[PDB]
From Swiss-Prot, chain B:
Protein name: Pescadillo homolog
Quaternary context: Component of the NOP7 complex, composed of erb1/SPBC4F6.13c, ppp1/SPBC19F5.05c and ytm1/SPAC890.04c. Within the NOP7 complex erb1/SPBC4F6.13c appears to interact directly with ppp1/SPBC19F5.05c and ytm1/SPAC890.04c. The NOP7 complex also associates with the 66S pre-ribosome.
Role summary: Component of the NOP7 complex, which is required for maturation of the 25S and 5.8S ribosomal RNAs and formation of the 60S ribosome.
Subcellular location: Nucleus, Nucleoplasm; Nucleus, Nucleolus
Source organism: Schizosaccharomyces pombe (strain 972 / ATCC 24843) (Fission yeast)
Curated annotation (Swiss-Prot), chain C:
Source organism of the structure: Schizosaccharomyces pombe (strain 972 / ATCC 24843) (Fission yeast)
Main localization, broad class: cytoplasm
Remarks, miscellaneous: There are 2 genes for eL38 in S.pombe.
Membership in a protein family: Belongs to the eukaryotic ribosomal protein eL38 family.
GO molecular function: structural constituent of ribosome
Subcellular location: Cytoplasm
Protein name: Large ribosomal subunit protein eL38A
GO CC annotations, alphabetized: cytosol; cytosolic large ribosomal subunit; preribosome
Classification via Gene3D superfamilies: 3.30.720.90
Keywords from the named record: Cytoplasm, Ribonucleoprotein, Ribosomal protein
UniProtKB/Swiss-Prot annotation, chain D:
UniProt entry keywords in alphabetical sequence: Nucleus, Phosphoprotein, Repeat, Ribosome biogenesis, rRNA processing, WD repeat
Family affiliation: Belongs to the WD repeat WDR12/YTM1 family.
Name recorded for this polypeptide: Ribosome biogenesis protein ytm1
Any GO MF annotation of the entry: ribonucleoprotein complex binding
Cellular compartments per GO CC: chromatin; nucleolus; nucleoplasm; nucleus; PeBoW complex; preribosome; preribosome, large subunit precursor
Function noted in UniProt: Component of the NOP7 complex, which is required for maturation of the 25S and 5.8S ribosomal RNAs and formation of the 60S ribosome.
Name of the gene this protein is made from: ytm1
Assembly and oligomerization: Component of the NOP7 complex, composed of erb1, ppp1/nop7 and ytm1. The complex is held together by erb1, which interacts with ppp1/nop7 via its N-terminal domain and with ytm1 via a high-affinity interaction between the seven-bladed beta-propeller domains of the 2 proteins. The NOP7 complex associates with the 66S pre-ribosome. Interacts (via UBL domain) with mdn1 (via VWFA/MIDAS domain).
GO annotation terms (biological process): assembly of large subunit precursor of preribosome; maturation of 5.8S rRNA from tricistronic rRNA transcript (SSU-rRNA, 5.8S rRNA, LSU-rRNA); maturation of LSU-rRNA from tricistronic rRNA transcript (SSU-rRNA, 5.8S rRNA, LSU-rRNA); ribosomal large subunit biogenesis
Domain of life per record: Eukaryota
Shown residues within the full chain: 95 to 432 of 440
WD repeats: 8-45, 47-78, 88-124, 134-173, 175-208, 214-254, 263-290
Sequence positions bearing Phosphothreonine: T46
Swiss-Prot record, chain E:
Coiled-coil segments: none
Other information: There are 2 genes for eL27 in S.pombe.
Protein name per its UniProtKB record: Large ribosomal subunit protein eL27A
Function, as annotated: Component of the ribosome, a large ribonucleoprotein complex responsible for the synthesis of proteins in the cell. The small ribosomal subunit (SSU) binds messenger RNAs (mRNAs) and translates the encoded message by selecting cognate aminoacyl-transfer RNA (tRNA) molecules. The large subunit (LSU) contains the ribosomal catalytic site termed the peptidyl transferase center (PTC), which catalyzes the formation of peptide bonds, thereby polymerizing the amino acids delivered by tRNAs into a polypeptide chain.
InterPro entries according to UniProt: KOW, Ribosomal_eL27, Ribosomal_eL27_CS, Ribosomal_eL27_KOW, Ribosomal_eL27_sf, Translation_prot_SH3-like_sf
Molecular function, one GO term: structural constituent of ribosome
């Protein structure tokens, strides 16, 4: 017979502590509990020494009068091109913060070229993509970029040096560049049959590499060690081998809606940002299931980005908080990737219930560029 | 002591003899679900 | 029987207590098959690369019983 | 040093070079104004075509080099007339240091290289005589050391490289835990003060680094005061010129507030004996402290 | 012109079949993403349970809670209805931009939930909040 768990003693209530007609009722309640109430008998990640961490924002770029949809940094690391719903493309000097290129020429996204000698930017406006080479660079760079190219149709102003406009049936949402700079991946969620298009600049042609697509495509990117194309659909993440035109792997995110994806430089790890306030770490050699799930954000998570060199990655959500994680990856089979929280950057505004829309990492050092809905760019150092 | 409890004096409160790095430590909740036992930290 | 396409999955299942034994099968096409006898399924990983083969074999836990062809 | 006066400019004062009389202030608007001791601009450089980066006068009231975002440094001889433009850098020249004794002047660029431009010896539109390379990241700034043949170069790679212009190679590259943005060489103390991105000024001995914190943001420029060799002023991104002391490593000796402020960020700092400490930045106003 | 912003209708196709919705805004012309006469609607996914003179305020409030939904629906899948439901809180909050922006979709869903709370508590559109038995 387990004990009836004797009631707690007096709680220091008395004639005058600085902290009875009902007595029969409590006693009756105690007697009731004696036969009616059931009786039941009852590591260290050490972030200090591994501090590739940054800290609070130091440089604030202002001049956007609307939400900044997407921003990117050139390979040289000194040019930061940003764009938003205003249609104004602004190129910023990272060290000084000047807005040297004020020419505007909605901007869904814009991406730099991988080739340093060919600074060409693919900028998406509605269903049209412009290949812009600003005259801020030396002249020989413009000629060097021209010979790169000089379904979707190709067509050949305050310094509007436009090269090849690409018109697509649907409004492109995501842009990605191949490592060699010859392939451009453009994705639109609205369409289906032709949701994603691959553009070969050297051949000057566009095609749909997919005969039949399942699920709406949210984003796309290129593998960093191989030509594989990572297609982030609404619920799945599918790996496609393009040279043999087939499907390699399918990642079961366990997510109602996938927002964005980022790829480790080693190519064996994928991080999935979700509208379900979840960051999904996938180890391609571990499982099609997520290796880790993280649900720290209070609102829908918008963007996830891995630093190309340093073992840090970040997640930007609509709550205005940017979550910075340290992810260490070893080539060993025993060594599972080490994911640890490092910082939670705050003090970012939310407009129309929209927060951190896009986050980008400096190619060299631990500098994070965050775009808000108020038109502000934060450079967390 | 009588002076404390003389007739009409003050009464001390009657006591019942029955009555008897931090940021990272608090925020380390990796994917654990049921293993998350912050219920104890929220009550105790 | 189950086929595993992920090496770290093979290690994780090997780490699991239900693992009983392991077989290494060397085929004539220089492709190795790492087979793991569990309570319910024979988990097989087809490794076509030689260098990944023996690093996996030394990656296997020492307590597990690994057996030649 | 009490503040003397402030002179307005069209844009942010990217580069400041203070001499006994001449005071060159190159701004982001593409104009470099040679302000006098009182503040009268003797002449303004025109036709640059790009945002000026840094100014460095080889001699007072004489030829003064001014780098621009177009990877070209124009040498205006003093009104200032552009005698020749030294170009050839892959990226924009981040900063340029002038040498009076030697025609070769070092110039750190964003292309991770330091080019030694020459007044006449340059390969003329004039390729640098010695385009030294080796820095992993962009070369943020270059300052000549005590010896005219050597110059310290700080960059984003967190490695301060003592490049010898005679040899064209970095003799020693001191690595630090934070990326350095500005380098100033104090010959009297035989030290090189580096404005690391961690808001700390590291005084490294060329022959080892003493760190001094206190700046609210990243340090943008450094210059040792001629009056006191132990004292060195440092204009940071917090629009403040923190003048620290080598002996007093526990913070800056005196933090001078900029005369004009706007989230302003001071960018250029110079320390002339006659003109005092000249500071400038995003406030578009060159202030002087005597 | 029987389908206007503020008209009650019924959904006959999809997961939310047999549910009563209010036309938030009509795109009778069509759209590139939806090449048909679609209209965005807000409906009641889980109808509130019936209440009685008895039961405490806790139970009455627990049974009075309403779960909404927002959905773009084809005209051919909507069944128009004579009753009309209008409130200024639900005018113009929804658009295509809201559907693309998932946080705005959730925010609009919560706003529709709250608006249905005051409406149900105030006792308006009792028919709209009564489930249809088919």
């Amino acid at each position: 017979a387990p004990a009836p768990k004797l009631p707690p003693p007096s709680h220091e209530e008395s004639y005058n502590p600085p902290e009875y007609s009902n007595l029969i009722k409590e006693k009756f309640e105690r007697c009731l509990d004696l036969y009616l109430a059931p009786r039941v008998r009852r590591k260290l990640p050490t972030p200090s020494e591994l501090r590739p961490f940054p800290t609070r924002c130091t440089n604030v770029f202002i001049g956007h009068k609307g939400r900044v949809r997407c921003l990117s940094v050139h390979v040289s690391g000194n040019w930061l091109a940003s764009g938003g719903d205003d249609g104004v493309l602004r190129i910023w000097e990272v060290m000084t913060g000047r807005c040297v290129w004020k020419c505007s020429l909605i901007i869904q996204s814009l991406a730099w070229g991988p080739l340093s000698d060919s600074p060409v930017l693919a900028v998406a406006v509605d269903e049209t993509v412009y290949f812009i080479t600003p005259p801020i660079f030396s002249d020989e760079q413009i000629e060097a970029s021209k010979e790169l190219f000089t379904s979707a149709i190709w067509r050949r102003l305050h310094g509007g040096i436009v090269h090849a406009t690409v018109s697509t049936p649907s409004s492109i949402k995501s842009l990605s560049w191949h490592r060699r700079g010859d392939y451009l991946a453009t994705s639109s969620p609205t369409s289906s049959s032709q949701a994603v298009l691959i553009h070969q600049l050297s051949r000057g042609a566009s095609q749909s590499p997919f005969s039949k697509s399942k699920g709406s495509v949210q984003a796309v990117t290129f593998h960093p060690t191989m030509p594989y194309l990572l297609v982030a659909t609404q619920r799945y993440v599918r790996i496609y081998n393009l040279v043999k035109q087939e499907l390699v792997k399918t990642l079961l995110t366990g997510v109602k809606w996938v927002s964005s994806l980022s790829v480790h430089s080693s190519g064996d790890h994928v991080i999935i940002g979700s509208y379900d306030k979840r960051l999904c770490w996938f180890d391609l050699d571990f499982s099609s299931k997520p290796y880790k799930n993280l649900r720290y954000h209070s609102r829908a998570l918008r963007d996830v980005s891995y630093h190309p060199s340093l073992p840090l990655f970040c997640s930007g959500s609509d709550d205005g908080d940017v979550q910075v994680f340290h992810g260490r990856v070893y080539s060993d089979l025993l060594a599972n990737p080490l994911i640890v929280p490092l910082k939670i950057l705050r003090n970012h505004k939310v407009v129309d219930n929209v927060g951190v829309l896009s986050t980008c990492w400096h190619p060299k050092e631990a500098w994070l560029f965050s775009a808000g809905a108020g038109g502000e760019i934060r450079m967390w150092t | 002591r009588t002076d404390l409890y003389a007739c009409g004096a003050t009464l001390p409160p009657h006591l019942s003899p029955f009555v008897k790095e931090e940021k990272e430590a608090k925020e380390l909740s990796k994917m654990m679900m049921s293993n998350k036992q912050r219920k104890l930290y929220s009550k105790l | 029987p189950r086929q595993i396409s992920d090496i770290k999955q093979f290690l994780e299942i090997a780490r699991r207590k239900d693992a009983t034994s392991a077989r290494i099968k060397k085929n004539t096409n220089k492709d190795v098959k790492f087979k793991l006898r569990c309570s319910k399924y024979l988990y097989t990983l087809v490794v076509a690369d030689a260098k990944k083969a023996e690093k996996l074999r030394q990656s296997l836990p020492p307590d597990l019983t690994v057996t030649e062809v | 040093p009490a503040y003397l006066a402030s002179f307005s400019h069209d844009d942010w004062i990217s580069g400041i070079q203070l001499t006994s009389d001449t005071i060159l202030t190159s701004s982001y608007d593409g104009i470099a104004r040679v302000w006098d001791k009182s503040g009268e601009i003797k002449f303004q450089s025109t036709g640059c075509g790009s945002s000026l980066k840094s100014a460095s006068w080889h001699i007072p009231n004489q030829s003064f080099l001014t780098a621009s975002l177009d990877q070209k440094i124009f040498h205006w001889v003093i009104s200032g007339i552009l005698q020749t433009l030294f170009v050839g850098h892959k990226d924009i020249v981040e900063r340029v240091r002038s040498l009076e004794s030697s025609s070769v002047f070092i110039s750190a660029s964003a292309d991770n290289t330091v080019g030694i431009w020459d007044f006449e010896r340059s390969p003329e539109a004039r390729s640098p005589l010695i385009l030294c390379e080796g820095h992993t990241g962009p070369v943020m700034d270059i300052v000549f050391s005590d010896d005219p043949s050597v110059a310290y170069s700080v960059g984003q790679d967190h490695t301060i490289k003592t490049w010898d212009l005679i040899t064209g190679q970095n003799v020693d590259s001191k690595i630090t835990k934070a990326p350095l943005l500005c380098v100033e060489k104090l010959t009297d103390l035989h030290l090189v003060i580096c404005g690391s991105s961690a808001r700390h000024i590291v005084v490294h001995d060329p022959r080892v680094s003493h760190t001094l914190s206190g700046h609210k943001n990243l340090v943008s420029g450094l210059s040792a005061s001629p009056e006191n060799p132990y004292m060195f002023a440092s204009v940071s991104h917090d629009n403040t010129c923190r003048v620290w002391d080598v002996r007093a490593t526990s913070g800056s000796i005196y933090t001078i507030s900029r005369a004009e402020k706007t989230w302003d960020k001071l960018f250029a700092v110079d320390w002339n004996k006659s003109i005092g400490i000249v500071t400038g930045g995003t406030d578009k106003q060159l202030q002087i402290n005597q | 012109k029987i389908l206007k912003p503020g008209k009650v209708a019924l959904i006959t196709r999809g997961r939310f079949a047999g549910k009563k919705v209010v036309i938030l805004q009509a795109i009778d012309q069509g759209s590139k993403s939806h090449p048909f006469g679609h209209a965005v609607v807000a409906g009641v996914e889980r109808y509130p349970l019936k209440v009685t003179k008895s039961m405490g305020a806790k139970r009455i409030a627990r049974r009075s809670r309403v779960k909404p939904f927002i959905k773009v629906v084809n005209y051919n899948h909507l069944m128009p209805t004579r009753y009309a439901l209008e409130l200024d809180n639900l005018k113009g909050l929804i658009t295509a931009d809201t559907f693309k922006e998932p946080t705005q979709r959730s925010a609009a869903r919560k706003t529709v939930k709250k608006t249905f709370e005051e409406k149900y508590q105030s006792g308006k559109s009792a028919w709209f909040f009564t489930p249809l038995r088919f």
